[PDB]
Structures are given as structure tokens and as C-alpha cells.
């Protein structure tokens, strides 16, 4: 509302002179790492480089949310969005690397339903490359076609047995791996198939998934690895 301001600019002020800050902006391209199919993911904006304020420093700590469906050109993985962290900005060419993964919220509420049992676990792990990262997991009980009984509930003893089997399998699989190998296992959801094959005997546990992955620490920049993954 126009007629509510009382102090306006405050105790004492004066109008501005120069406006329209968009005359000094620049547009940059964004790339993607090696395993993904498409590399261009959009455009980004930043102020033009000037004295006392370099542009490259402002484009080294940005994060981006990109759905995995766009990266893989496939509508099956339309419920996962991942984070990408910018590291080095080549001329008119931003280079990026992995920064995380996460499911969409709406699918998780569509999975959560009454009168069944949900199994959940998490675990921290470190790779051969000195990355400290944490994993989340999800599973649900499976209905049987000929059941007449209304409810499907599991006993806590098997619940903890499943939790132990999940933790041991995930730790064994993620014990000795690199980022390129693990992501090459993430996009086809390899981990789930071993979880289900190991656990069918105790109880079915349909909808095995890795909820999210987040990293805590990183080693030195190691530009050689970034240039190894980029520019194919």
C-alpha cells in the first residue's frame, strides 16, 4: 500500500541516482560430469569482473538443483533431484562436480501408507578417495496376493535383523569405491537388488531405496581429477 509508509527511508535520507543494475551482468554456461549423458543444464548469471572484485571468486561456491531425469534423458527417474557444486570456472565454461542426491517429497508421501511396516537406516562411510559421506535407506513390507488378513506387521526381532543385514551389505558395497563407480551404480539402482536378494528369506521388504546421500568432508582440490572427469 502506498499510503502506509511513515518514516520511509528512515531518520533522514535522499533518493538514488543510478538504477537498472542489469547493465553489468554476464551469462555463463554450465556443464556436467562424465557419467551423465547431457552436459548442458542451463545458464547462470553473475556480475562482470572488475577491479578489486574478480568474477571467478563469486562462481566457486554455488550449488545447483538438477533433476536426474533431465541428465539421463529418461522419465523413469523423474522423482530424484541432485545437487551439484561448482569448483572451477573455465572461460565462458563453468565446470561442476557432484554435491548430493535426494528423492522428491511427494513420492515419499505416496509410498508412506497405513497398516504396514517401514524399515529405515543410515550409515557413514569413506571411500578410497578421501570422501566422508553418509547414506540413507528405505524399505517397506510386501503384501502377499492370497492374504485374507487385513494387516501386515513384522516382529521387532526380524526388524533389527533386517537393519543389521542392510547395514552390513551397504558397508561392504561402499567400502572400496570411487565416485564415478558409485554413481554408475546409483543411476541403475544396483544396491537395491542386492539388498532384496539378501533379505527375501527373512521377510520380503519391497521398495528398497537409498533415500539420500550427503558428504561431510573433502580433501585438497586436486584439479587433475576434475579435468579427468570433465572435457570428454
Amino acid at each position: 500500500v502506498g499510503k502506509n509508509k511513515r518514516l520511509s527511508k528512515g531518520k533522514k535520507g535522499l533518493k538514488k541516482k543510478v538504477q537498472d543494475p542489469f547493465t553489468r551482468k554476464d551469462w555463463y554456461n554450465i556443464k556436467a560430469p562424465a557419467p551423465f549423458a547431457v552436459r548442458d543444464v542451463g545458464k547462470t548469471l553473475v556480475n562482470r569482473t572488475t577491479g578489486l572484485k574478480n568474477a571467478n571468486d563469486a562462481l566457486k561456491g554455488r550449488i545447483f538443483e538438477v533433476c536426474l531425469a533431465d541428465l539421463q534423458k529418461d522419465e523413469d527417474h523423474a522423482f530424484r533431484k541432485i545437487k551439484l557444486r561448482v569448483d572451477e570456472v573455465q572461460g565462458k565454461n563453468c565446470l561442476t562436480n557432484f554435491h548430493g542426491l535426494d528423492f522428491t517429497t511427494d513420492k515419499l508421501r505416496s509410498l508412506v501408507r497405513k497398516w504396514q511396516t517401514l524399515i529405515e537406516a543410515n550409515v557413514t562411510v569413506t571411500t578410497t578417495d578421501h570422501y566422508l559421506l553418509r547414506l540413507f535407506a528405505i524399505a517397506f513390507t510386501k503384501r502377499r496376493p492370497n492374504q485374507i488378513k487385513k494387516t501386515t506387521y513384522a516382529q521387532s526381532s526380524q526388524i533389527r535383523a533386517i537393519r543389521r543385514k542392510m547395514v552390513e551389505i551397504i558397508q561392504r558395497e561402499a567400502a572400496s569405491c570411487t565416485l564415478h563407480q558409485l554413481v554408475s551404480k546409483l543411476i541403475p539402482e544396483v544396491i537395491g537388488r542386492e539388498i532384496e536378494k539378501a533379505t527375501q528369506g527373512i521377510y520380503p521388504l519391497q521398495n528398497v531405496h537409498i533415500r539420500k546421500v550427503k558428504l561431510l568432508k573433502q580433501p585438497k582440490f586436486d584439479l587433475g581429477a576434475l579435468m579427468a572427469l570433465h572435457g570428454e
Binding site: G2, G42, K43, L45, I63, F64, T105
Partner: protein
């Protein structure tokens, strides 16, 4: 003035519309929160405080958002819906749909519907007391 690109391809942005039960905010960025393309709210456009959250006010705000972002070169938007969250209502306000429709009708492109309402895993005690608002 704008990013050079061929006519066939189109560039993406993201709009974060916050629709509570007292006011609505429309904010457009560039697929990241570092840069804000434009922002307008119901309050300046409307002439009465109560009407700031009306669907009509949200549609009017969406029209001049599309007008302001058209010359920047951006041609398509993703939307990120969020409610009050936390201890709030978690139900989007009345001016959500209005502005969303006005954005679609103005000619803009739409993709990647999403809801970003913040939900706690286990929240603190909520305002009001043991007897609630007794009116």
C-alpha cells in the same frame, strides 16, 4: 543484453512463490538463489491491507512478473511451491493457484512441479497454550 542462444532452444529459470494465509510473495531467480531476477508483492499493487493476499492480487503480481522477466531473455520457468511450514498451517494460501494460472496464461512455459513446504521431524511445542485461541 541477453544470453546469445539459437532460436530453437529455450533457457530455464525458477520461481519461488510463497503463499501464506495473510499475504503472497512471488520471487524469480536463475536456477539458484544467488541472483534475483525480480520480486513484487501484493502490497504495493493493492490499495487495502486485507486484499493483499487475494487471488486477484496474486494474478496481477504474476502479470507484471512475466512482463518484467520477458525482456531479460528467460522464456521458461520451474515452480517451487512452499507453505508456511514449521508449526504453521502447511496448506498453501488462496493466492497460489491464481498466480500460477496467470503465469501459464501469459504465455510462459512450465516444468517440474514441486512442493517445498518445510516439515519437521519432531518439532517444539506450538504457540497458543493448552486451551487454544478461544474465539
Amino acid at each position: 543484453l541477453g544470453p546469445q542462444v539459437r532460436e530453437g532452444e529455450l533457457v530455464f529459470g525458477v520461481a519461488r512463490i510463497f503463499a501464506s494465509f495473510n499475504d503472497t510473495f512471488v520471487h524469480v531467480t536463475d536456477l539458484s538463489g544467488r541472483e534475483t531476477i525480480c520480486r513484487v508483492t501484493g502490497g504495493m499493487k493493492v490499495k487495502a491491507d486485507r486484499d493483499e493476499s487475494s487471488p486477484y492480487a496474486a494474478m496481477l503480481a504474476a502479470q507484471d512478473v512475466a512482463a518484467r522477466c520477458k525482456e531479460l531473455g528467460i522464456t521458461a520457468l520451474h515452480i517451487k511451491i512452499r507453505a508456511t511450514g514449521g508449526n504453521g498451517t502447511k496448506t498453501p494460501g488462496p493466492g497460489a493457484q491464481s498466480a500460477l494460472r496467470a503465469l501459464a496464461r501469459s504465455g510462459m512455459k512450465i516444468g517440474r512441479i514441486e512442493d517445498v513446504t518445510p516439515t519437521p521431524s519432531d518439532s517444539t511445542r506450538r504457540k497458543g497454550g493448552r486451551r487454544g485461541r478461544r474465539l
